[PDB]
Design a binder for this molecule. Structure first.
Ligand SMILES: Nc1ncnc2c1ncn2[C@@H]1O[C@H](COP(=O)(O)OP(=O)(O)OP(=O)(O)O)[C@@H](O)[C@H]1O
Ligand SMILES: Nc1ncnc2c1ncn2[C@@H]1O[C@H](COP(=O)(O)OP(=O)(O)OP(=O)(O)O)[C@@H](O)[C@H]1O
Ligand SMILES: Nc1ncnc2c1ncn2[C@@H]1O[C@H](COP(=O)(O)OP(=O)(O)OP(=O)(O)O)[C@@H](O)[C@H]1O
Ligand SMILES: [Mg+2]
Ligand SMILES: [Mg+2]
Lengths: 247, 70, 73, 101, 390, 393
């Protein structure tokens, strides 16, 4: 019936997809996400929004997701569309693995998912997925990697990025304080703690309103880890101490 | 005009209320079913300085009113 | 008591009433829905009340409210 | 009120305490300010604080009060307010409920 | 100085200047000081300082306006209602005959015994008397070109029946009494209406649809009713509603009320046009860019009997319009106006007049005093091509 | 002063000269005869005492009534203040040029015969809309347009300056000019300039200020606006942000949009309708013009339509030096370095950059403004762009 149709897949009078624009407008309110590619690691730093004394601790994380042995991604937007996209990503990785017996390279994967998303915003009459992704991984083609996606289907390799709340501010400092090719994993983590401390203007890093991820190569194989409470709080104490000495 | 004359009455009330010396025992009490619809000019100090809620009865008041009416 | 005529525009409504006035002899009063709406509050009712009063006083009579839909909403 | 106090300083104490910087820099001197927000947020308290610190008079009027009965009472009140503010060289006016007009 | 406008410029300037000086000198030498009490030129305090004012104040008493409400018994006895003074039961002074006075007419009465002396014209809302044309426009039927059948129909419905009633009365045809003129913007509706107003020989009234919406409830209907009563006092009148789509909107009342008072005024106009009360000698015209929005009751024969379509002019009419507007110009002798008609594809009268004026412009900017072909080609370029995207 | 019209060709000619010389010579004979009579007899006493007779006829307690209908024949219906309606005789000394319905007439006390009129207030709306001189600046502060300013000058100023040009050839000026273009590009400013530079009464209105919250008030407002423009000699009207009132006119709409359309019809009639518009011009502005109604911007209503592009490379330099004009700057100001970037900057953006740089210079107490401040301010102002980056590109 044409009376109730929404036309979620039709051009506006200036060639801009409105449902897509609103989808990207939803992301600018979910938790902030940060990307930093070091010379010896990659790292995702999003904010833990589910901040209540009556929530339980479950799973190894709350926003970081594994996709292969050598790949992980974090989400900003709707939680449910996030779950749907994560599942499809896992399926893509396993299908490539089954066909070639090699781990799926990273741009292999990111473009497969974005192709699903783009197709979804091209025809069908559905609403688009209101999710923007950040990924991390290693493959024998380009080493440590950091990609990003949007409701449109566009992606991009970023040496450092920010998708989500206060994206402008975070990318502004990331431009001011990024050493292209001159970053260790430790320095990148410290830069993340600083930038996030700015952005999460509500209080300071409580070591509990934050999520951090690291992807490294150890003993010839990838190792993915989510920073515990003690190390995160120690890093924050180091950050405050450094800022105090600086003043 | 009509609204102008009503505004004239209202302003005259305010001007008369403000015309006291705190040494004359003339008091004023007015009742309204909608306080929010009043203009604020009445609520300002010097004029009407107490608002007394008359809420619906609660259990204890319901008991007392029943006993007193029965 | 009363008669109402309804039909699509131009289906012969006012013409029948005009004919009835032509043949009948009691006092006729014309009208229009929009004629009883006055700006001043309480004027339309006074118009109606005085019209019925004149009709009553001047022997038996008929009132023809054309465009009754103006006020009967 | 550190944020608002610093802001009002920078926006008014400069034209009064240091009315030279604007002359040299050629940037015209701001002629007033507007205060807005929910009720009871220290607007009058800050207005009084700045009026006392700047050693200027604090002629005060309420826009609601400005809406009096006599015709032109608003116009006459405005004329009187400005002429008196002119008689007192150091002066700062505090039309309170400008929205009501 | 300047480049030099004309050989006599300085001489005419001098004669003007000394004209102004001699006028000022006579002004000072005659007085005529402006008076804040609205008092006439002293040479025009004439019969005013005396000899008519002193002769008009004695015999011409002050009558007072009163509105008769009833005329009871055959014997003269009149109930009048003096505005904001009182209500009386008075008689006729000798000057007025009993036939002159009717119920509901304003009358003048004296200040002592309040007897009736003179009738007076009715009271008409100031906003309903200005819509009379007073001074008629000068546009005529030679100024409208490329519309020949349309103008024929309009002339046969609004114009011919009044001038020569016997043609129609003999054969027994009551001519149509309404016309709906509709066509693309700027095709010739209001101009043909101006021409009809100029040529016609009866009262003309201009009503804008946007002039009948009013703030207070039940006012627009009163305005329409008064307008038709007034037009019915005259011997014959034409009313030309513009932008009638303004108040002829379709009826769609549903849920929360929206645009209902406009609907009541529209119904009042409907009932005035064709209804129980006969419509006398009145002919109506309407113009709209959007005729579909008009309601099913108005667009029906009996109210809007004809429907004239105005279409963009054909090539012959195109050249004709070009030539009408290029008349009072200082233009070259030979211009292949057929070439200009061809060079502009489907375009309305407003396009063409704009073309003429833009050609005049390109003549001026080149500091020339006679318009040539190149001027018109530049004009057509700058008008059609450049302003296409709008 | 009610002098004769030459009605020779009206353009510098020999006939205009002889009809002109003749009026001058008659005025000369009249002046000589008058001076002779005045020397021969003052007549001051005779001219006086006519004032005395008049003031005798008009008694001391003259009453201010309100004329309500002139019967066209030296009679009137004058309403006293209470509300009564009298039918009086108009005497011979009242300047009848000043008698129109609604005028405060001055009646006799015992006989109410009309014996004078009074002036009225000049502010129905004249004060509220007229803009007087533009506080911003004259044509000096505007640069980079050149062609556009020339168009406007020819459209609105030149027909006032030298009517002979248009008159010589028999063509009337264009009717109205619509200024259209991207936001912040010099429309309102150019209108302000051609206002403060010309010699007519220029009136300004915002479209959203014609959206009225009582029915039939918007049409009244437009009708008045075009009513006190012929009362005032040559006049100009500039309806800014017209887009808010004139829109595509989609029919599938509900609410107060119908009133918007009805006021639009009133305007559409005022601009070019049944009657002759007299001597008035109409300027309009619209940031978004693709959405106007075809009948509003059609040829006979608005002949001239002006596009307004952004500054390209050099008008940027001009504007920058226009706004930085009044401020002490350090000798390291790499202005071109700020201009060279193809950031699609707009004129209002240039003003924002100038003001923000000046303000932070004030913040840091520094007696002068530095290049680093200007670049930081540029970054800060451009920070108000937003949007979705990969999307659409
Ligand atoms: N059955 C009919 N017999 C004769 N005339 C008819 C008939 N139906 C319609 N008409 C003609 O219709 C013309 C206009 O119709 P009329 O206004 O009388 O009808 P209506 O239904 O009252 O209309 P409205 O809704 O406009 O008031 C009249 O001149 C009448 O001649
Ligand atoms: N056939 C024509 N001959 C001469 N001039 C014409 C012709 N058609 C249009 N014009 C010119 O078009 C100008 C626009 O006014 P006109 O009366 O034609 O508009 P309209 O068709 O009534 O438009 P609207 O639909 O906007 O009310 C007129 O002044 C006249 O100069
Ligand atoms: N070429 C220019 N010369 C001088 N000032 C300019 C120029 N271009 C823009 N401006 C500045 O633009 C400011 C904005 O006012 P302006 O009248 O130009 O707005 P506008 O173009 O009409 O805007 P809008 O499209 O929002 O109506 C003016 O104060 C003026 O300082
Ligand atoms: Mg009927
Ligand atoms: Mg602009």
């Amino acid at each position: 019936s044409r009376r109730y149709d929404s036309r979620t897949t039709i051009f506006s009078p200036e060639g801009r997809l409105y449902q897509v624009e609103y989808a990207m407008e939803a992301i600018g309110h979910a938790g902030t996400c940060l990307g930093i590619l070091a010379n010896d690691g990659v790292l995702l730093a999003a904010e833990r929004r589910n901040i209540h004394k009556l929530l339980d601790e479950v799973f190894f994380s709350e926003k970081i997701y594994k996709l292969n042995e050598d790949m992980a991604c974090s989400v900003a937007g709707i939680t449910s569309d996030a779950n749907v996209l994560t599942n499809e990503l896992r399926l893509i990785a396993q299908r490539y693995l089954l066909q070639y017996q090699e781990p799926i390279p990273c741009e292999q994967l990111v473009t497969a998912l974005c192709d699903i998303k783009q197709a979804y915003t091209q025809f069908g009459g559905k609403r688009p997925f209101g999710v923007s992704l950040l990924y991390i991984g290693w493959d024998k083609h380009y080493g440590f990697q950091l990609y990003q996606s949007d409701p449109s289907g566009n992606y991009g390799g970023w040496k450092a990025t920010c998708i989500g709340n206060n994206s402008a501010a975070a990318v502004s400092m990331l431009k001011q304080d990024y050493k292209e090719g001159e970053m260790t994993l430790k320095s990148a983590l410290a830069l993340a703690i600083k930038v996030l401390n700015k952005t999460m203007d509500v209080s300071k890093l409580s070591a509990e309103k934050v999520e951090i991820a690291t992807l490294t190569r150890e003993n010839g194989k990838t190792v993915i880890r989510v920073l515990k409470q003690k190390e995160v709080e120690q890093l924050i104490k180091k950050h405050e101490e450094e800022e105090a000495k600086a003043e | 005009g009509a609204d102008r004359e009503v505004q004239r009455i209202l302003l005259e009330l305010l001007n008369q209320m403000d015309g006291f010396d705190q040494n004359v025992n003339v008091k004023v009490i007015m009742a309204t079913n909608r306080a929010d619809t009043l203009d604020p000019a009445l609520l300002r100090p010097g004029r009407l300085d107490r608002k007394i809620e008359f809420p619906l009865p609660d259990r204890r008041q319901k008991r007392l009113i029943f006993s007193t009416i029965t | 008591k009363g008669v109402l005529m309804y039909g699509p525009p131009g289906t012969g409504k006012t013409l029948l009433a005009r004919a009835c006035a032509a043949q009948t002899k009691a006092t006729f009063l014309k009208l229009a829905g929009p004629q009883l709406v006055q700006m001043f509050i309480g004027d339309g009712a006074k118009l109606v009340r005085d019209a019925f009063a004149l009709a009553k006083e001047k022997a038996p009579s008929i009132i023809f409210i054309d465009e009754l839909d103006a006020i009967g909403t | 009120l550190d944020k608002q106090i610093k802001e009002i300083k920078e926006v008014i104490e400069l034209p009064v305490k240091h009315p030279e910087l604007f002359e040299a820099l050629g940037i015209a001197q701001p002629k007033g300010v507007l205060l807005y927000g929910p009720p009871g947020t220290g607007k009058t308290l800050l207005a009084r604080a700045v009026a006392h610190h700047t050693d200027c008079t604090f002629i005060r009027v309420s826009g609601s009060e400005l809406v009096q009965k006599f015709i032109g009472e608003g116009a006459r009140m405005v004329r009187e307010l400005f002429v008196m503010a002119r008689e007192h060289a150091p002066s700062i006016i505090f039309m309170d409920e400008i929205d009501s007009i | 100085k300047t480049y030099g406008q004309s050989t006599y410029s300085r001489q005419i300037k001098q004669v003007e200047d000394d004209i102004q000086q001699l006028l000022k000198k006579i002004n000072e030498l005659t007085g005529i000081k402006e008076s804040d009490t609205g008092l006439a030129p002293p040479a025009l305090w004439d019969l005013a300082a005396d000899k008519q004012t002193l002769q008009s104040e004695q015999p011409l008493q002050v009558a007072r306006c009163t509105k008769i409400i009833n005329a009871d018994s055959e014997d003269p006895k009149y109930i009048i209602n003096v505005k904001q003074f009182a209500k009386f039961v008075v008689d006729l002074s000798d000057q007025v005959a009993p036939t002159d006075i009717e119920e509901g007419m304003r009358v003048g009465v004296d200040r002592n015994k309040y007897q009736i002396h003179i009738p007076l014209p009715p009271k008409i809302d100031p906003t309903v008397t200005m819509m009379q044309v007073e001074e008629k426009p000068d546009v005529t039927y030679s100024d409208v070109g490329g519309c020949k059948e349309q103008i024929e129909k309009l002339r046969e419905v609004v114009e011919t029946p009044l001038l020569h009633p016997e043609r129609f009365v003999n054969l027994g045809i009551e001519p149509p009494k309404g016309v709906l003129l509709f066509g693309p913007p700027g095709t010739g509706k209001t101009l043909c209406a101006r021409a009809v107003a100029n040529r016609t020989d009866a009262c003309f009234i201009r009503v804008i649809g946007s002039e009948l919406v009013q703030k207070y409830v039940g006012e627009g209907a009163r305005m329409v009713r008064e307008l038709f009563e007034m037009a019915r006092t005259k011997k014959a009148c034409l009313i030309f509603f513009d932008e009638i789509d303004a108040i002829g909107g379709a009826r769609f009342d549903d849920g929360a009320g929206g645009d209902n008072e406009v609907q009541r005024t529209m119904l009042e106009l409907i009932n005035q046009l064709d209804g129980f009360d006969p419509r006398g000698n009145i002919k109506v015209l309407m113009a709209t860019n959007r005729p579909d929005t008009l309601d099913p009751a108005l667009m029906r024969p009996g109210r809007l009997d004809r429907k004239i379509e105005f279409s963009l002019p054909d090539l012959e009419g195109r050249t004709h319009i070009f030539k009408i507007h290029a008349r009072s110009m200082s233009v070259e002798r030979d211009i292949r106006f057929e070439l200009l008609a061809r060079l502009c594809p489907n375009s309305t009268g407003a396009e063409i007049r704009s073309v003429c004026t833009e050609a005049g412009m390109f003549a001026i900017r080149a500091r020339r005093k006679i318009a040539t072909e190149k001027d018109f080609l530049e004009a057509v370029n700058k008008v059609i091509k450049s302003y296409a995207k709008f | 002063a009610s002098k004769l019209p030459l009605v020779t060709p009206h353009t510098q000619c020999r006939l205009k000269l002889l009809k002109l010389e003749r009026i001058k010579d008659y005025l000369l004979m009249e002046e000589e005869f008058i001076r002779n009579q005045e020397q021969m007899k003052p007549l001051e006493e005779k001219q006086e005492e006519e004032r005395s007779k008049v003031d005798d006829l008009r008694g001391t307690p003259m009453s201010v009534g309100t004329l309500e209908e002139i019967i066209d024949d030296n009679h009137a219906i004058v309403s006293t203040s209470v509300g009564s309606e009298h039918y009086v005789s108009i005497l011979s000394f009242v300047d009848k040029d000043l008698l129109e319905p609604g005028c405060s007439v001055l009646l006799n006390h015992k006989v109410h015969a009309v014996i004078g009129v009074l002036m009225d207030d000049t502010d129905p709306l004249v004060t509220v809309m007229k803009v007087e001189k533009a506080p911003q600046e004259t044509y000096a502060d505007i640069g980079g347009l050149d062609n556009q300013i020339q168009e406007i000058k020819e459209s609105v100023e030149l027909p006032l300056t030298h009517p002979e040009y248009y008159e010589e050839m028999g063509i009337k000026p264009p009717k109205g000019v619509i200024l259209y273009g991207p936001p912040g590009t010099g429309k309102t400013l150019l209108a302000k300039a051609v206002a403060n530079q010309t010699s007519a009464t220029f009136l300004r209105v915002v479209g959203s200020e014609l959206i009225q919250k009582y029915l039939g008030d918007g049409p009244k407002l437009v009708r008045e606006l075009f009513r006190v423009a012929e009362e005032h000699a040559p006049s100009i009207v500039f309806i800014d942000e017209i887009d808010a009132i004139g829109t595509k006119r989609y029919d599938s709409n509900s609410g107060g949009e119908r009133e918007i359309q009805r006021t639009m019809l009133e305007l559409l009639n005022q601009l070019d309708g049944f009657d002759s518009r007299g001597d008035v011009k109409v300027i309009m502005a619209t940031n978004r013009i693709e959405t106007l109604d075809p009948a509003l911007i059609r040829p006979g209503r608005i002949d001239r339509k002006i596009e307004f592009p952004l500054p390209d490379e050099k008008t940027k330099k001009r504007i920058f030096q226009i706004h930085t004009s009044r401020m002490t700057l350090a000798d390291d100001v790499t202005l071109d370095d700020l201009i060279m970037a193809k950031d699609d900057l707009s004129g209002a953006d240039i003003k924002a950059i100038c003001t923000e740089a000046g303000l932070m210079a004030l913040r840091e107490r520094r007696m002068k403004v530095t290049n680093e401040d200007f670049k930081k301010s540029k970054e800060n102002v451009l920070y108000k762009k937003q949007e979705g980056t990969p999307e659409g590109l």
